[PDB]
Amino acid sequence: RPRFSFSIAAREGKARTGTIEMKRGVIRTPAFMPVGTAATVKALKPETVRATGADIILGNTYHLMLRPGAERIAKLGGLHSFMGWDRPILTDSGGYQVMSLSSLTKQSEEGVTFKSRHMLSPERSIEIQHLLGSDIVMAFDECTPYPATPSRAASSMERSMRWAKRSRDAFDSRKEQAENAALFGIQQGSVFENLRQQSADALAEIGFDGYAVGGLAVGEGQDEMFRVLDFSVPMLPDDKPHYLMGVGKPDDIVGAVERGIDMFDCVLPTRSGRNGQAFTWDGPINIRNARFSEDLKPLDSECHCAVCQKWSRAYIHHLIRAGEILGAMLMTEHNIAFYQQLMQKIRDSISEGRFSQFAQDFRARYFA
Amino acid sequence: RPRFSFSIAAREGKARTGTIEMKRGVIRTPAFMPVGTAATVKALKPETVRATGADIILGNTYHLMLRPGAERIAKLGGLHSFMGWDRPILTDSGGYQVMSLSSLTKQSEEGVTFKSRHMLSPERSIEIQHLLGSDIVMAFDECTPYPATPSRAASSMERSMRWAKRSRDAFDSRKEQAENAALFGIQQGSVFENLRQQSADALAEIGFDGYAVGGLAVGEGQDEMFRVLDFSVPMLPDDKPHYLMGVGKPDDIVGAVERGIDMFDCVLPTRSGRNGQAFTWDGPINIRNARFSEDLKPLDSECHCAVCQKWSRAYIHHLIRAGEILGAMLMTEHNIAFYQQLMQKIRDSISEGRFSQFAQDFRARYFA
Ligand SMILES: N#Cc1c[nH]c2nc(N)[nH]c(=O)c12
Ligand SMILES: N#Cc1c[nH]c2nc(N)[nH]c(=O)c12
Ligand SMILES: [Zn+2]
Ligand SMILES: [Zn+2]
Numbered sequence: 001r002p003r004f005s006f007s008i009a010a011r012e013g014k015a016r017t018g019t020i021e022m023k024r025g026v027i028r029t030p031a032f033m034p035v036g037t038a039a040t041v042k043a044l045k046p047e048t049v050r051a052t053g054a055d056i057i058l059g060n061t062y063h064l065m066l067r068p069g070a071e072r073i074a075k076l077g078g079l080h081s082f083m084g085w086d087r088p089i090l091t092d093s094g095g096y097q098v099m100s101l102s103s104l105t106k107q108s109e110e111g112v113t114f115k116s117r118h119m120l121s122p123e124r125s126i127e128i129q130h131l132l133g134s135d136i137v138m139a140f141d142e143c144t145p146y147p148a149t150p151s152r153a154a155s156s157m158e159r160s161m162r163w164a165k166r167s168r169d170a171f172d173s174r175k176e177q178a179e180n181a182a183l184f185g186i187q188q189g190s191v192f193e194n195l196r197q198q199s200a201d202a203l204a205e206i207g208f209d210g211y212a213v214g215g216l217a218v219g220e221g222q223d224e225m226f227r228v229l230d231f232s233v234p235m236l237p238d239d240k241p242h243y244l245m246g247v248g249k250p251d252d253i254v255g256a257v258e259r260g261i262d263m264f265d266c267v268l269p270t271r272s273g274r275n276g277q278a279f280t281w282d283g284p285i286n287i288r289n290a291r292f293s294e295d296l297k298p299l300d301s302e303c304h305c306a307v308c309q310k311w312s313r314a315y316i317h318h319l320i321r322a323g324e325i326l327g328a329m330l331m332t333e334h335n336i337a338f339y340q341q342l343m344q345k346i347r348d349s350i351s352e353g354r355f356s357q358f359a360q361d362f363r364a365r366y367f368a
Numbered sequence: 369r370p371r372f373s374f375s376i377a378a379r380e381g382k383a384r385t386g387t388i389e390m391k392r393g394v395i396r397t398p399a400f401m402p403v404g405t406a407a408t409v410k411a412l413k414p415e416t417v418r419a420t421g422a423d424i425i426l427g428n429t430y431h432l433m434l435r436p437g438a439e440r441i442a443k444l445g446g447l448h449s450f451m452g453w454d455r456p457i458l459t460d461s462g463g464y465q466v467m468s469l470s471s472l473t474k475q476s477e478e479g480v481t482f483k484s485r486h487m488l489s490p491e492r493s494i495e496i497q498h499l500l501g502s503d504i505v506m507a508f509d510e511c512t513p514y515p516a517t518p519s520r521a522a523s524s525m526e527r528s529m530r531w532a533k534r535s536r537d538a539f540d541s542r543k544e545q546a547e548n549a550a551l552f553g554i555q556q557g558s559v560f561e562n563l564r565q566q567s568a569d570a571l572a573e574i575g576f577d578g579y580a581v582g583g584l585a586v587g588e589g590q591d592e593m594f595r596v597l598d599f600s601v602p603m604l605p606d607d608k609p610h611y612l613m614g615v616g617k618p619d620d621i622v623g624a625v626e627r628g629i630d631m632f633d634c635v636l637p638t639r640s641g642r643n644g645q646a647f648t649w650d651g652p653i654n655i656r657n658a659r660f661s662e663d664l665k666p667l668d669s670e671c672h673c674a675v676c677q678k679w680s681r682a683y684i685h686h687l688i689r690a691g692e693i694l695g696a697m698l699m700t701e702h703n704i705a706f707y708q709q710l711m712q713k714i715r716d717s718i719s720e721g722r723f724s725q726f727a728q729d730f731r732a733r734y735f736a
Contacts, residue, residue, distance in 0.1 A: 039686065043693040068661070068686045076662060076682055084678050293436070294444060310452050314444055318407065318436045325411040325693055 001025075004182040004209050006241050010351045014233070014260040017350040020241060022135055023180060024080070025087045027055045029241065030257050030346055032339045033090060033265040038063045039073075039083045042270050043328045044336070046085040052305065052333065053340035056088040056136070058265045061128050062097035066116055070128040078133030090136035090265075092245070093125045093167070095160075095186070095214075096143040109159065111140070122166035130177045137177070138212065139167035141186040146219035153190035160188045160214075161202040168206050182209035184243060187236065190215060191228045200235030210241040213261070217246030226255050233260035250279060250342055251366060254359050257346055269335035274328040276320045279338040283366050287331065292317040305337035369393075372550040372577050374609050378719045382601070382628040385718040388609060390503055391548060392448070393455045395423045397609065398625050398714055400707045401458060401633040406431045407441075407451045410638050411696045412704070414453040420673065420701065421708035424456040424504070426633045429496050430465035434484055438496040446501030458504035458633075460613070461493045461535070463528075463554070463582075464511040477527065479508070490534035498545045505545070506580065507535035509554040514587035521558035528556045528582075529570040536574050550577035552611060555604065558583060559596045568603030578609040581629070585614030594623050601628035618647060618710055619734060622727050625714055637703035642696040644688045647706040651734050655699065660685040673705035 001023050008018040020027040034041045034049055035058045041049050049057060059079055064070060073082050080086055099105060102114035111121025125140035140163050144156040164185050171183045185208035189195030203211060213232055216225045225247070236242055243263035244256050253264055269279065276288040280300040285292075287299070298308035299316065307316075307330045319327030349358035369391050376386040388395040402409045402417055403426045409417050417425060427447055432438060441450050448454055467473060470482035479489025493508035508531050512524040532553050539551045553576035557563030571579060581600055584593045593615070604610055611631035612624050621632055637647065644656040648668040653660075655667070666676035667684065675684075675698045687695030717726035 038690055038692065039683070040692050040694045043697070045694065045697070067690060068682075072662060076664060076680070082680075082683050082686075084683075294440060296444060312444070312450075314436075315407070315450050315452075318450075322406055322435060324406065324408050325696055326408045326413065328693055329411070329413070329697070 003180060006210070006239070008239070010353075012350045012353055012355045013258065015257050015346075015350050015355050016260065016262060017347045018262075020088075022088050022182065024089075024135055025055065027088060027263075028343070028347060029262040030253075030343055031055060031263045032253070032343045033058045033263065034336050034339075035265055035267050035270065036060075036083070036085075036089075037267070038067060039079060041332075041336075043274065043325070043332045046083060048333055049085070049336065050087070052337040053344065054336065056090055057085060059089050059091045059132060059134065060097060061091055061094035061125055061132075061138075062101065062120070064132060065094070065118070065120075065128050070131040074131040074133075080133055088135040089133075090184075091129045091132055091134035091138060093129065093138040093140040093186075094120050095125070095138075095141040096245075099143065107142075109162075122163045123170045126167055126170040126174075126177075130174055130181075134181060136182045136184060136210070137171060139164045139183065139185050139208070141188060141214055143218060144188055144190050144215050146190065146215070148190045150190075150192055150195070153188075153192055154195055157188040157190075157195050157199050160186065161199060164203060165206050168208070184208055184210040184212050184241075186212040186214040186245070187232065188214050189232075191220065191224060193231050196228070196232045197235055200232070204237055208240070210243060210263075211236040212243040212245050214245055216244065217248060217266075222252060222255070225252070226259065229256060229259040229261070250339070251363065253339075253342065254346065254362055257350075257355075258359055269339050270332050273331035273335040276331065277335075278316075278331060279335050281362075281365055282368060287313060287317050288320055289317075299334045300338065303334065303338060303341065305334050305341075307331075307334040307337070371548060374578070374607070376607070378721075380718045380721055380723045381626065383625050383714075383718050383723050384628065384630060385715045386630075388456075390456050390550065392457075392503055393423065395456060395631075396711070396715060397630040398621075398711055399423060399631045400621070400711045401426045401631065402704050402707075403633055403635050403638065404428075404451070404453075404457075405635070406435060407447060409700075409704075411642065411693070411700045414451060416701055417453070417704065418455070420705040421712065422704065424458055425453060427457050427459045427500060427502065428465060429459055429462035429493055429500075429506075430469065430488070432500060433462070433486070433488075433496050438499040442499040442501075448501055456503040457501075458552075459497045459500055459502035459506060461497065461506040461508040461554075462488050463493070463506075463509040464613075467511065475510075477530075490531045491538045494535055494538040494542075494545075498542055498549075502549060504550045504552060504578070505539060507532045507551065507553050507576070509556060509582055511586060512556055512558050512583050514558065514583070516558045518558075518560055518563070521556075521560055522563055525556040525558075525563050525567050528554065529567060532571060533574050536576070552576055552578040552580050552609075554580040554582040554613070555600065556582050557600075559588065559592060561599050564596070564600045565603055568600070572605055576608070578611060578631075579604040580611040580613050582613055584612065585616060585634075590620060590623070593620070594627065597624060597627040597629070618707070619731065621707075621710065622714065622730055625718075625723075626727055637707050638700050641699035641703040644699065645703075646684075646699060647703050649730075649733055650736060655681060655685050656688055657685075667702045668706065671702065671706060671709065673702050673709075675699075675702040675705070 185203040295313040553571040663681040
């Protein structure tokens with residue numbers, strides 16, 4: 001297999017379906033990436049993640065650099081061996097999380113220093129991702145808070161683009177990395193069209209293997225995110241993957257595919273799983289609700305996951321109410337499976353030229 | 369398969385190996401029973417429990433009667449369907465737990481009433497076990513606290529024996545239960561030989577499918593428990609299973625088999641698993657200890673479990689230190705697997721007439 005090859009096998013409007021071939025495996029697109037904080041997809045064995053249909057998972061520069069340490073994981077053989085996932089891993093660069101989780105920060109042109117004292121810069125971020133043995137490396141960016149004035153949004157975007165160039169060069173500098181991994185740039189600009197264009201252009205000029213749409217999962221309502229996607233994704237190179245970071249709910253995902261996005265990540269299925277929220281084709285339910293205490297149906301009536309073929313709502317209800325680990329396990333497995341079944345339905349419907357009808361049908365039921 | 373058939377296929381000194389055939393399956397003896405509070409073996413899918421080699425698991429009258437409720441589980445189809453375990457289940461009667469976990473109790477000849485207001489009596493305990501669809505029903509007893517004066521120990525034992533007769537008759541009264549399940553009596557008497565004899569005798573006179581040794585897991589040191597086992601187990605009918613309740617550490621188990629016990633249960637492998645204690649043939653280790661942070665070996669060098677073939681100490685160390693659910697999962701799977709491998713080694717060595725040498729060899733290493 002090649003280092004990186006994105007091929008589009010079918011299209012419908014702005015939506016696309018295909019594959020990314022990399023050395024550790026093939027990624028079917030549009031793709032949902034379970035998130036794996038902190039070298040684990042919470043409450044799932046790797047094999048279980050794979051069984052739900054996941055082709056790739058996300059790891060985080062920020063958390064692993066604090067625990068257990070980037071150099072340590074490198075010493076132990078890389079993230080894949082450490083956690084037992086042998087397929088592609090995309091690592092976020094830390095750009096977001098450093099500002100999100102740190103107890104104290106100092107931002108500067110050089111990078112960000114923080115307490116949880118550490119510095120994170122384009123160079124270090126790319127080095128950490130290297131040490132982890134990431135397959136898809138993210139540029140070190142700044143995720144602009146929402147809302148943002150045009151001035152501050154512009155300043156932030158410009159910095160991110162300078163950091164994008166520094167990320168590129170740091171990646172290319174490391175032969176082993178350049179030859180075996182891929183590098184994705186990250187578009188910023190808040191919700192402003194001219195800034196998103198200048199950002200798209202700076203990224204394309206630098207050149208990346210894929211293009212992420214940053215900053216649209218930090219407060220924007222769906223209508224606003226969709227409006228920004230409407231003009232923003234066509235700015236990106238058509239022949240490269242389009243990754244919407246941090247999105248999202250099943251309906252976010254469907255609308256974003258309708259707008260040209262090929263890759264997604266979100267903690268919602270996992271986190272909300274452990275809190276008792278289960279996704280269904282008729283909308284999300286809270287399994288803790290009293291009305292499920294003697295409900296013998298599965299979580300969802302059509303889901304093929306192992307959880308739905310074996311246990312009832314009533315049981316899972318009991319587990320979560322009891323704070324039992326197996327509840328978290330079952331809820332999470334179901335939710336990730338559901339997300340993967342959604343992606344398959346999306347891929348298949350685009351392949352067959354009936355995606356717009358799928359999206360309409362999905363919405364009708366999900367929102368009923 | 370018959371309702372109940374215990375056959376002894378080989379012996380060595382007081383130790384025995386064989387099988388219990390029941391309608392839902394065969395139990396290899398000596399047997400370790402993972403404990404399944406509250407309709408779950410914590411952090412394991414049923415299938416995972418089975419894969420470690422478990423033939424039967426323990427459920428608890430006390431906890432399930434409070435949550436989710438005995439009648440409710442009966443409504444939903446019985447404990448086996450509810451939790452997805454289709455093999456034998458032994459249910460404890462509540463005798464122990466009511467006094468152990470309840471917030472307020474009133475003991476009387478009729479039974480125990482408690483707040484966590486509920487009453488538990490021989491009749492209700494047996495009815496609850498029925499409702500759950502238990503395969504091996506335990507008599508409702510009183511687990512005498514340790515230490516105990518001879519007077520109080522005698523009074524407690526006598527009550528337990530009256531309750532044993534009431535348990536027997538309540539069980540026999542329910543045709544469905546009498547025909548498909550088994551009933552085990554429970555010997556009490558504290559550490560006193562004459563009381564253990566009177567108890568053994570009252571139990572044998574009543575007649576049960578198996579005989580448990582109660583009250584030896586509530587403070588007694590090993591030397592004392594072994595001394596009491598030394599005279600107590602020969603008092604029980606030889607041709608019926610001998611169950612030591614609540615025991616124990618791997619070395620407890622080996623010494624108790626040496627004294628004629630065929631069945632064990634304990635929360636140690638599960639609970640201590642989640643707290644970071646892993647069993648090894650060289651003794652238990654605490655995986656949280658700093659010295660495991662870059663240790664690439666498996667939990668144990670010889671263990672065949674899935675955990676030891678796939679993940680390192682270093683990873684599991686990281687998980688538990690991070691309070692990750694997958695740490696609890698992996699630790700628990702390993703620990704139960706280890707317990708089952710111990711039981712297999714015991715069964716095989718008795719079958720081959722080299723159990724006394726196994727026990728000596730085990731102790732030498734484990735205590736090295
Ligand atoms: N919005 C949003 C984001 C979610 N994850 C992100 N990660 C990075 N590196 N940048 C981003 O803007 C975001
Ligand atoms: N010792 C001890 C025991 C552990 N579980 C028990 N369960 C019952 N019913 N009785 C017992 O004495 C004990
Ligand atoms: Zn499901
Ligand atoms: Zn193991």
